[PDB]
Amino acid sequence: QSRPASDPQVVEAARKEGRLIIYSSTDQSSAQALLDDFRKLYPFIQIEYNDLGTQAIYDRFVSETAAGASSADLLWSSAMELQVKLASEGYALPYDSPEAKNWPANARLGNLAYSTTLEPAVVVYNKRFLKPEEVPTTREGLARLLQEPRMRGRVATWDPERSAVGFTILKADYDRFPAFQELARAFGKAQAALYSSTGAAFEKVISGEHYLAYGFFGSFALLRQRTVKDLGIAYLTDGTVAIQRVAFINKRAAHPNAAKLFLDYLLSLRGQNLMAYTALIFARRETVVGEATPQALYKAVGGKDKVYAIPVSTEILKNLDPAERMRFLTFWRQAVR
Ligand SMILES: [Cl-]
Ligand code: NA
Ligand code: NA
């Protein structure tokens, strides 16, 4: 009774194909439950899951296509600007997902690419050093906390010069919230350490070498919290930036119908529910019940209007413009040093 909406012509052509190749940035141990469940629905499809860095996905896909080689059927990546760039340059199979009828226009590049997640950039902290009631939930509040001598060298955030996702998140913050400028200068005052990776930042918070990290995905925070009871999460109430992992089907898929079934599964309530519940990846689909969901996120930030979803839109390509990049990085480097 929860099987994704299927075109019978598509399921029958997927049987003949009987294979699916995925290039994905989602860690395989996070995706596993979805792969196993997809196979229970479509046990006639053999999956090749390639778990790759977001740059690897873009380079590898661009290479194979250009050399004319067989590449991925489906590309699934948290690098929104690179996915949107490929899908707006002829790399994407146009396909109207029957599971995406209620997707907001800003969660889909028409029929070229789809959001699969709505993941908030949050504050994480070490509850042995900071109690929940003293962790501010606004940029101005965090800027105030970081004036305290006890916070000097105790703060982590992204290095937007070494992380594409870190860039997306901090740039969205800078473009949307004036108070971000005060907070960036406070990272300077506090001698914030910058990280190219969520895991390197989280390790230092768990160790107590930092007490607080700003701008990391709630999905990773929740996943680590399962293991680590001293990890606190605070949601920003003056405005939260959310990233959307983008999926699209290769225009040249060898198995385009298998890729439609998997894209439909990723978007369905069955797939979105399993992703939220088992992977603790914040779902896109608003009907999912549980902690890693739009409803839970909206209650935590004080309403839907306080979440800015980075859109699945060619408008985000301004982030790749050298002049725009430079203006942001010029401000950033001046403020945080
Ligand atoms: Cl990361
Ligand atoms: Na389907
Ligand atoms: Na639904």
TrEMBL record:
<dbReference type="Pfam" id="PF01547">
    <property type="entry name" value="SBP_bac_1"/>
</dbReference>
<keyword id="KW-0732">Signal</keyword>
<protein>
    <submittedName>
        <fullName>Iron ABC transporter, periplasmic iron-binding protein</fullName>
    </submittedName>
</protein>
<dbReference type="GO" id="GO:0030288">
    <property type="term" value="C:outer membrane-bounded periplasmic space"/>
</dbReference>
<dbReference type="GO" id="GO:0046872">
    <property type="term" value="F:metal ion binding"/>
</dbReference>
<feature type="binding site">
    <location>
        <position position="25"/>
    </location>
    <ligand>
        <name>Mg(2+) 1</name>
    </ligand>
</feature>
<feature type="binding site">
    <location>
        <position position="27"/>
    </location>
    <ligand>
        <name>Mg(2+) 1</name>
    </ligand>
</feature>
<keyword id="KW-0479">Metal-binding</keyword>
<dbReference type="InterPro" id="IPR006059">
    <property type="entry name" value="SBP"/>
</dbReference>
<feature type="binding site">
    <location>
        <position position="27"/>
    </location>
    <ligand>
        <name>Mn(2+)</name>
    </ligand>
</feature>
<feature type="binding site">
    <location>
        <position position="27"/>
    </location>
    <ligand>
        <name>Mg(2+) 2</name>
    </ligand>
</feature>
<keyword id="KW-0614">Plasmid</keyword>
